[PDB]
Design a protein around this motif. Structure first.
Motif, short mmCIF file in Angstrom:
data_model
loop_
_atom_site.label_atom_id
_atom_site.label_comp_id
_atom_site.label_asym_id
_atom_site.label_seq_id
_atom_site.Cartn_x
_atom_site.Cartn_y
_atom_site.Cartn_z
N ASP A 69 47.59 16.03 9.87
CA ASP A 69 48.86 16.73 9.63
C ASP A 69 50.08 15.87 9.94
OD1 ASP A 69 47.69 20.05 10.62
OD2 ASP A 69 47.70 19.15 8.58
N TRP A 123 52.41 14.11 6.93
CA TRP A 123 53.83 14.39 6.87
C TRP A 123 54.57 13.08 6.67
CZ3 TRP A 123 57.78 14.05 11.17
CH2 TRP A 123 59.03 14.46 10.72
N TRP A 124 54.24 12.09 7.52
CA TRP A 124 54.86 10.76 7.39
C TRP A 124 54.70 10.21 5.97
CZ3 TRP A 124 54.28 5.73 5.97
CH2 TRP A 124 55.16 4.83 6.48
N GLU A 131 56.70 12.29 3.22
CA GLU A 131 58.11 11.91 3.34
C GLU A 131 58.44 10.56 2.71
OE1 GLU A 131 59.69 15.47 5.04
OE2 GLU A 131 60.61 13.86 3.94
N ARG A 132 57.45 9.81 2.27
CA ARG A 132 57.70 8.59 1.46
C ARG A 132 58.14 8.85 0.02
NH1 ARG A 132 59.46 7.24 4.46
NH2 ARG A 132 58.35 8.16 6.22
N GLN A 133 57.98 10.09 -0.47
CA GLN A 133 58.35 10.37 -1.83
C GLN A 133 59.85 10.59 -1.95
OE1 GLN A 133 56.79 13.88 -3.84
NE2 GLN A 133 56.82 12.64 -5.76
N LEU A 134 60.47 9.90 -2.91
CA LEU A 134 61.93 9.94 -3.09
C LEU A 134 62.28 10.86 -4.24
CD1 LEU A 134 62.39 6.22 -2.31
CD2 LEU A 134 63.27 7.97 -0.87
N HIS A 165 47.96 17.02 -2.14
CA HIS A 165 48.88 18.10 -2.55
C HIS A 165 50.19 18.16 -1.79
CE1 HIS A 165 46.71 19.65 0.89
NE2 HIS A 165 47.42 20.78 0.93
N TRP A 166 50.38 17.35 -0.75
CA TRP A 166 51.66 17.35 -0.02
C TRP A 166 52.74 16.55 -0.76
CZ3 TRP A 166 50.47 17.05 5.98
CH2 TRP A 166 49.92 18.26 6.36
N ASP A 169 54.71 15.92 -4.63
CA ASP A 169 55.05 16.51 -5.92
C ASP A 169 54.42 15.59 -6.99
OD1 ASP A 169 56.63 16.83 -8.38
OD2 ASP A 169 57.77 18.40 -7.38
N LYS A 210 56.22 14.76 -10.58
CA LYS A 210 57.26 13.77 -10.34
C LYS A 210 56.73 12.37 -10.02
CE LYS A 210 61.12 14.66 -8.21
NZ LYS A 210 62.62 14.99 -8.01
N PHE A 219 62.22 11.71 13.27
CA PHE A 219 60.81 11.39 13.44
C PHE A 219 60.51 11.13 14.91
CE2 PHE A 219 58.14 11.08 9.73
CZ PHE A 219 59.02 11.08 8.64
N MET A 279 60.27 19.34 -2.79
CA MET A 279 59.15 18.36 -2.89
C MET A 279 58.12 18.45 -1.75
SD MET A 279 60.64 14.80 -4.58
CE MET A 279 61.75 14.38 -3.19
N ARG A 280 58.54 18.98 -0.60
CA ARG A 280 57.64 19.24 0.54
C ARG A 280 57.20 20.70 0.65
NH1 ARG A 280 59.35 14.04 0.34
NH2 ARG A 280 61.40 15.01 0.63
N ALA A 324 54.57 22.35 -0.46
CA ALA A 324 53.14 22.45 -0.09
C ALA A 324 52.91 22.09 1.39
CB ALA A 324 52.29 21.56 -0.98
N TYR A 325 53.55 21.01 1.84
CA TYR A 325 53.47 20.67 3.26
C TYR A 325 53.98 21.83 4.11
CZ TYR A 325 54.78 18.88 7.87
OH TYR A 325 54.90 18.68 9.28
#
Ligand SMILES: CN(C(=O)[C@H](Cc1c[nH]cn1)NC(=O)OCc1ccccc1)[C@@H](Cc1ccccc1)C(=O)N[C@@H](Cc1ccc(O)cc1)C(=O)O
Ligand SMILES: [Ca+2]
Ligand SMILES: [Zn+2]
Lengths: 324, 306
Positions: free
Chosen positions: A206, A210-211, A214-217, A249-250, A252, A255, B208, B282-283, B285-286
Motif C-alpha cells: 500500500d 501510493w508512491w 503518484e508518479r503519473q502526471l 489499477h492504482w 489511470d 491516460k 511524503f 487519477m488516484r 482507485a487508490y
C-alpha cells in the motif's frame, strides 16, 4: 512538471514498429556505433519486442548465437560485444536471448553460474563485474540470470534478500545501495528480485503502491521520481512494479495508454522517450511491453518481472507468484 | 552543416577505439592508452570497458614508476574525472571510477571530496549519484550523522527541490537514536516539515516525509502531541481554504484524523474522500482502496465495544 501533449498518434502501429526493428542495424549508422558498448542488451530489446509482436523469425538466429558465443569470456561472464569486458548486465541479456531462442547450451552454462556466484559479496550484494560497483540492479541481474537457468540455489539467497531489504526506504521504495533514495528503476529491480525469491510479502504494497501511482502526471505518463518529466521507459518500470505488487489499477490506465501511443513515430516506426522525440529500440520495447501489460490484444502477454513473453517463461517452468 | 559536424567526429571515434583495443591485446598498458581513452571517454563516459582499461594501465604503471610519478598520475586522473563529471554529471562509470581512485590512495583528501559534493549538489540538488558519492565520502572520513543532519537543514531552507534531502534525513534521524523515533525528536521534525509545506504547499516532498512521521511514533497520544496534531489539522483546513485544488493537504487532513480519532471523525473522513477524489480523479482507485481499508479498521474498533 509534465509534457503538455500535442496532436499525437492514438493508434497502434505494429506494422511500422516491426519494420523498424528488422531494419535497425543496417551498419554505418551513428547512434548504432556509439551504442556498441551495450549491443548485447540492444539485441535483447530488438528480439523481445519482435517476439511479443510475433515477428521473431525476421531476425537472424544463427548469426546471433555465434555473436553470443563469441562474447562469453574465460571467466564465464558475457560482454556487450566482442572485445568488450564481461558484465552482469550483458550476461542477463544473453541468457534472456538464449531463453527466447531455446538455446542456453550455445554458452557454457556452468561457467555463467560460477561467474554470477563470484560477484556476490559478504553482505549479500552483487558487484557488476570485477571492478566492484555495488547496485541492487545487479542483485536483479544475478537472480534473474540464475532463475532462467534453474540455478538460483547457486547463490547465498538469504544474504541476497537481506541486502535488498536493507535498501528499502521510508517511502516504501528502494535505491541502489543502503541509504540511497528511492527511484522507479531501482524499485522495478528490487520488486523483481523479491518476486523471483518469493519475498513479496516483505514489501509494503500500500505504501509503495501510493508512491508509484503518484508518479503519473496529468499528461498520463509516469516519471521515475518526483519533479521529473514523464517517459515511456519509467512508464514501464512503474507499471511493471505496480503489477508485481498487485496495484496496477492504482493508475489511470486509459491516460497511460494514450501517453504511450503519443510516443510512436508515425513515419519511421519505433517508439521514443516522449512524444515527437527521436525513436529507439529500448523505448520501442518498453512501450509495446507497457501496452501489453495494459491489455492490448495485438501484443503477446509480457512478464512484468523478466520483460519477456509469458509463453517463453511458461516453457522453462519459471513463473514467480506476484502479489494481490 | 548538419552532416558536416556529425560524420567528422564518428571517424575519429572509430580510429581511437580501434587503436585502444589493438594496444590492449598487444599488452601496451601505457600513457598512450590514457591519451586515446581521454578522447573517447569525454564524449561517452558510459563506455565502461574504457574505464576498465584506464584502471588497468594505472595499476600497471604504479609498478614501473616512482611514487612521485604515480602521485602525479593520480592527480591528473582526478582532474580528468572532474572535467568528465562537468560534461555528464550522471554517469555511473565516471563516479565509480572516482571511488576506485580515492579508495586506493595512501592519504586521500576527503574534506575536499565533500566539497566537490557540496558543489555538484548546488548545481543539481537532486543528483542521486552525487548524494551516493557524498555518503561514501562521509563514511570514509568517519563523519558523524549529527553534522550530515546540520548540512541537510541548510539545503531545505535555502531553496526547494528537497526530496533528496528529506530522504537523507529519514536515514540520519534513526542513526542519532539507535534502536532495534523518540517523541521529542518526532515533534521537532513535525515542526520543520509543516513549516516547509505551508511555505510551498505544492512541494510534494514534505508531504511524503510527513506521512512517514505520522506513522513513525496513538492513543498513547500525549496532550502535547494531541494538541500539535489538532493544530496541524486546523492549519491544513486553512491551507485548504486558500488552495482548494491542493490534493496533498486533503489526504493529510484524512491521515491526521485517523491519527487522532478514527471513529469520532468518521463523518468528516468520508466527506474528505469525496472532495479528494473530485480534485485528484487519477488516484480514485487508490483512494477507494484506502477508504475501504479504513472503514474496515472502523468496523474492528466499533466491535471491541461492550
Ligand atoms: C541505468 N539506467 C538505465 O536505463 C540502464 C540502461 C542500460 C545500459 N546498458 C544496459 N542497460 N539500465 C540498466 O542499468 O539496467 C537495469 C535493468 C536491467 C535489466 C532489467 C531491468 C533493469 C537508468 C537508471 C536505472 C536505474 C535502475 C534500473 C534501471 C534504470 C538511467 O540512468 N537512465 C538515464 C539515461 C539513460 C537512458 C537509457 C539508457 O539505455 C541508458 C541511460 C536517465 O534517465 O537519466
Ligand atoms: Ca531469421
Ligand atoms: Zn527513457
Amino acid at each position: 512538471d509534465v509534457t503538455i501533449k500535442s496532436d499525437a498518434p492514438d493508434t497502434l502501429l505494429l506494422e511500422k514498429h516491426a519494420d523498424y526493428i528488422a531494419s535497425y542495424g543496417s551498419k554505418d549508422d551513428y547512434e548504432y556505433c556509439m551504442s556498441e558498448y551495450l549491443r548485447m542488451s540492444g539485441v535483447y530489446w530488438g528480439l523481445t519486442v519482435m517476439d511479443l509482436m510475433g515477428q521473431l523469425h525476421r531476425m537472424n538466429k544463427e548469426e546471433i548465437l555465434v555473436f553470443i558465443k563469441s562474447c562469453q569470456h574465460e571467466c564465464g561472464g558475457v560482454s556487450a560485444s566482442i572485445g568488450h569486458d564481461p558484465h552482469l548486465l550483458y550476461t542477463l541479456s544473453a541468457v534472456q536471448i538464449l531463453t527466447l531462442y531455446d538455446s542456453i547450451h550455445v554458452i557454457n552454462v556452468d561457467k555463467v553460474v560460477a561467474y554470477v556466484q563470484s560477484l556476490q559479496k559478504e553482505d549479500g550484494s552483487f558487484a557488476g563485474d570485477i571492478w566492484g560497483e555495488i547496485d541492487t540492479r545487479f542483485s536483479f541481474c544475478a537472480v534473474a540470470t540464475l532463475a532462467l537457468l534453474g540455478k538460483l540455489d547457486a547463490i547465498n539467497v538469504e544474504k541476497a534478500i537481506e541486502f535488498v531489504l536493507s535498501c528499502m526506504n521510508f517511502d516504501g521504495g528502494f535505491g541502489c545501495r543502503p541509504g540511497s533514495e528511492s527511484h522507479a528503476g531501482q524499485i522495478y529491480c528490487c520488486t523483481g528480485f523479491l518476486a523471483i525469491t518469493s519475498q513479496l510479502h516483505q514489501v509494503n504494497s500500500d505504501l509503495l503502491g501510493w508512491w508509484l501511482c503518484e508518479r503519473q502526471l496529468p499528461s498520463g505518463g509516469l516519471n521515475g521520481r518526483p519533479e521529473k518529466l514523464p517517459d515511456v521507459c519509467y512508464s514501464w518500470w512503474v507499471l511493471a512494479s505496480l503489477k508485481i505488487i498487485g496495484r496496477l489499477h492504482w493508475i489511470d490506465r486509459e491516460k497511460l495508454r494514450s501517453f504511450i501511443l503519443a510516443c510512436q513515430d508515425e513515419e519511421t516506426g519505433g517508439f521514443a522517450d516522449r512524444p515527437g522525440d527521436m525513436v529507439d529500440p529500448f523505448h520501442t520495447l518498453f512501450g509495446i511491453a507497457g501496452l501489453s501489460l495494459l491489455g492490448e490484444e495485438q501484443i503477446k502477454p509480457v512478464s512484468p518481472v523478466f520483460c519477456m513473453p509469458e509463453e517463453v517463461l511458461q516453457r522453462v517452468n519459471v513463473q514467480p507468484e506476484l502479489v494481490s | 552543416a548538419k552532416r558536416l559536424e556529425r560524420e567528422q567526429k564518428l571517424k575519429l571515434y572509430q580510429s581511437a577505439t580501434q587503436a585502444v583495443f589493438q594496444k590492449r591485446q598487444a599488452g601496451e598498458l601505457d600513457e598512450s592508452v590514457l591519451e586515446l581513452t581521454s578522447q573517447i571517454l569525454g564524449a561517452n563516459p558510459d563506455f565502461a570497458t574504457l574505464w576498465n582499461c584506464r584502471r588497468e594501465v594505472l595499476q600497471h604503471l604504479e609498478t614501473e614508476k616512482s611514487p612521485e610519478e604515480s602521485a602525479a598520475l593520480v592527480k591528473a586522473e582526478l582532474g580528468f574525472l572532474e572535467s568528465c563529471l562537468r560534461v555528464n554529471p550522471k554517469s555511473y562509470g565516471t563516479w565509480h571510477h572516482r571511488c576506485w581512485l580515492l579508495s586506493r590512495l595512501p592519504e586521500p583528501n576527503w574534506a575536499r571530496e565533500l566539497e566537490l559534493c557540496a558543489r555538484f549538489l548546488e548545481a543539481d540538488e537532486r543528483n542521486f549519484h552525487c548524494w551516493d558519492y557524498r555518503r561514501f565520502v562521509a563514511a570514509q572520513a568517519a563523519v558523524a550523522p549529527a553534522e550530515e543532519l546540520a548540512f541537510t537543514d541548510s539545503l531545505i531552507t535555502r531553496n526547494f527541490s528537497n526530496y533528496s534531502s528529506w530522504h537523507y534525513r529519514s536515514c540520519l534521524l534513526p542513526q542519532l537514536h539507535p534502536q532495534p523515533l523518540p517523541e521529542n525528536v518526532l515533534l521537532k521534525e513535525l515542526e520543520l516539515v509543516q513549516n516547509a509545506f505551508f511555505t510551498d504547499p505544492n512541494d510534494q516532498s514534505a508531504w511524503f516525509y510527513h506521512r512517514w512521521l505520522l506513522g513513525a511514533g496513538r492513543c498513547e497520544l500525549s496532550v502535547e502531541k494531541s494538541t500539535v496534531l489538532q493544530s496541524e489539522l486546523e492549519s491544513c483546513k486553512e491551507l485548504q481554504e486558500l488552495e482548494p485544488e491542493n490534493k496533498w493537504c486533503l489526504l493529510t487532513i484524512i491521515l491526521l484524523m485517523r491519527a487522532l480519532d478514527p471513529l469520532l471523525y468518521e463523518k468528516e473522513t468520508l466527506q474528505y474522500f469525496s472532495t479528494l477524489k473530485a480534485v485528484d480523479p487519477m488516484r480514485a482507485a487508490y483512494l477507494d482502496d484506502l477508504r475501504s481499508k479504513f472503514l474496515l479498521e472502523n468496523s474492528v474498533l466499533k466491535m471491541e465495544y461492550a
